[PDB]
What we know:
part of a larger assembly; 6 chains; D: 51 residues; mainly alpha; 1 helix; rod-shaped; F: 40 residues; 15% helix; binds magnesium ion; RNA-binding
Amino acid sequence: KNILKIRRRKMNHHKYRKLVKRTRFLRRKVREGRLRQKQVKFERDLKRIWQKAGLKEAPAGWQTPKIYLKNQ
Amino acid sequence: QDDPPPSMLLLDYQNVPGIHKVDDVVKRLLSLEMANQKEKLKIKKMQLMNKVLENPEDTSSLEARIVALTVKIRNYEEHMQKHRKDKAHKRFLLMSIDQRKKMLKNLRETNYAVFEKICKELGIEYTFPPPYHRKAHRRWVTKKALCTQVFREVQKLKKQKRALRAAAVAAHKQG
Amino acid sequence: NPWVQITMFKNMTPSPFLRFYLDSGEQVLVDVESKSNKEIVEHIRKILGKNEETLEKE
Amino acid sequence: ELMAWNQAENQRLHELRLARLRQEALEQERRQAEEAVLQAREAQAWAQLKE
Amino acid sequence: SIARSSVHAKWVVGKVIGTAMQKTAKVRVTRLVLDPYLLKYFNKRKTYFAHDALQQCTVGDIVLLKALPVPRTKHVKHELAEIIFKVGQVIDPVTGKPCAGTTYLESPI
Amino acid sequence: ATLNQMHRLGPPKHPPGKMGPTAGRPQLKGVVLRTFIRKP
RNA sequence: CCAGAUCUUAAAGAUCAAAAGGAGCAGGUAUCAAGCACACCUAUAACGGUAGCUCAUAACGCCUUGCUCAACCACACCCC
Ligand SMILES: [Mg+2]
Ligand SMILES: [Mg+2]
Ligand SMILES: [Mg+2]
Ligand SMILES: [Mg+2]
Ligand SMILES: [Mg+2]
Ligand SMILES: [Mg+2]
């Protein structure tokens, strides 16, 4: 009966958790790896604007904070 | 803040005959002094509906309900001050602040002058519901902040580059 | 009449009516109150209609 | 000619309305009497109890 | 006799959406459109800016727009003609009396 | 569902077919690598 | 809605019709959700003044594509 659907899920979940334990630190890399792409693409997004709006420098008092890498 | 004075003689006893001759003990018993809080809220209700309204009798009047609701809100706010952890009553307050806004939108569509005067009296302000409810998140708030400042700059630069042209062409026209 | 804007407002005015805005700036006002649905239709047809002959011609 | 005919219709109907509304006013006064009587009675009762 | 506008908009009525500009009203128009699958009529909306001398339009007003003969800007092709219902103050076209909703404020007699 | 829903979602479109192994062409010219055998 | 080109002709007709527009209709995808000055006001006569505009009725993207066919749109070695 419908348990037979749940069994599949139950297994697929278990078999996933196990995986994410072994793979943990590999995972941890690739997460942060993409956060450093994010923050960069983000930056370029704004850089694009100065250069598109004709300004040479980034406007006064702009440090362009890091949102994605926010921790603690 | 208003203050329904300690001696105010609970509402249901206000208009009955032969009160003031009565001795100070019983007066003390029927005072707001010995009252529940519900009583004080009946009073606040009365006073507010006298100051604000036209026809004290109409309950169904859109105005009336706005005033009454406002009284109860003001109460939920004090109860909110003293209990900050109480989620239930936070819910009531925030539903109610809203419903009041609903009926205010009704006044503003239907009878304008009246709506106006109520907003004046009860210190309620009507802020039109802004289109597009979107959760502003860090990425967006930041990119907008930047853009706003880029604008604020390019209009400055345009201003100066045209200002030196004003100065140059005027200094050539003068001599 | 696919080119004629038809708008509808609810409960603004305590008595029901039609309005009509013509090319001239002529404002027609048709009071429909205890009228039958059919009566409104035929009344409108009367006021700004087209003669049957007009249509047939076209 | 048409517009004037329309005008006429509006006039006549307007009148019918006026008559109706007058009727409703008489009805409203009768009601107001009934209301005032019941309100007065309960005012009596409440006053009694309080005193 | 030539004064024209190439735009089909020639006369419309819409709500007044926003006041945010000087002497220019943001007015939303709504026409019925027949959805061909369902064969039903739905409200399609379109916004028009309009020009105002008095800057007289509150938000929420039912307003009559007249096409302008020569367009002011890309986005302004209209002039507010008459206010059909000023919001919150509405005087019944029939009887010429002040009203709110179903109720007259000052009745006949 | 309801009519407003059927309006907002439009009528259903019949999804374009996913091209198979031949990538849409009737046949393909090909060059042999290794002849071999498979089990059913 | 028509500038212009051409044709006819005793100056006004006619055929194409650029640009510019907008009632409405118009490929997939929302895992593309915000775009980033995209508005207006002054008729002063190119300067000033406001702080706006678009967008969940799908803006801004990305992907695929001639077409609604007495025809229409587009290209003409590539760098629109
Ligand atoms: Mg499995
Ligand atoms: Mg990743
Ligand atoms: Mg209590
Ligand atoms: Mg053309
Ligand atoms: Mg995906
Ligand atoms: Mg400027």
